[PDB]
Amino acid sequence: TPFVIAGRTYGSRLLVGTGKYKDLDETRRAIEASGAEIVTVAVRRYTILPNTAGCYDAVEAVRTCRLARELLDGHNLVKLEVLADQKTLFPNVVETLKAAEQLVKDGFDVMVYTSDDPIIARQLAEIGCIAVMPLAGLIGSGLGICNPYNLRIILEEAKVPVLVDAGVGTASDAAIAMELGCEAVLMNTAIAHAKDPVMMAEAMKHAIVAGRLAYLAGRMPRK
Template structure:
């Protein structure tokens, strides 16, 4: 039986610590199946890439709004003003007060423009949004985002869609020591072991899209990610043994008669 260990964001409880995306799937039906297999409670939707109403069945028709919390994101925005406008459009469309804030600074690396990101965070927080910014793995920026009112900070594990895994676990650990809001690894996960490593660092959750949608068997990978996030969380709470240079016997001889 799973322990009651909810993720709390913006005052709302989520039973899963895996957040998944909606892009890059070959079919909407497969996306639906992967969402279920992942066990996630929250799914991200790129507002600027959504279909207009009246154009037939849209992405939102394939998401059970009673089952999943929609996390609109501002993907494709390159300055604070466009990100703020996109977030407001999402709320006007009835999607959510939650927003995954992306303000991209470079088209090739998709690294964030942290100056514009902090600016947009301040504006959206004042407007009542629950802001979850995608950011670099810089502890100073993470602290500025917390001070700006972010409900969580989401440092990249590696560049978006790269599948490189957690490239700098030490920066992630420093961020966790620097801020008091939840830390969520966003971007870079390639396979289940990457998700487990992220969770074992002690982060609150992992957000991913390409690792599932781009897998050879997305449905199997979604299930694997579900188990990996749960295993990593349990391992982090259990506490690993210290690393040692030399062996330590599993069955010590001390106390055995005749020794």
């Protein structure tokens, strides 16, 4: 089917992050290999997805978004990302709800990072948000899907696109995400931190397409 976000339709269902590589040659050759169409960048540090990485308040996230919307010539596409603390890098869903509401009535097209909590993921799509992106595992933990149960509920009732964002460890992790029903996946550390970044990219490139086909194909039951 068609992978459409905020009106625009894309080919690659593999969003990819930046800033974790060793240099531009690498990130260039990598996100090139990943086959990604949308690539997110941490403003505070094709289709570019400015994300508020680094923010800890709705007020900070909201300001970073305004200041990125004007550096990108009024582009409303933003990845809201209000974290709790530099330690767990776990989302502060209360502040995220705060900022998400503010950003929506401010003309933005928000793709919001969040926990696997299915009810807060519900409200985020209600107050707007083009897409809700529950995490797979903690950021940079390379753990993969840690709560497939909650992930299924979020997908079952998702009224907007669902993207598993962050926490991925290898190809299979991403394949599984798609198999569960995600519209796309977003990763950074899994690629940029593999011994050979450019290959992991090509791997995920196939990883997310393989699982996406498997989802649509409708797998056999279990004896």
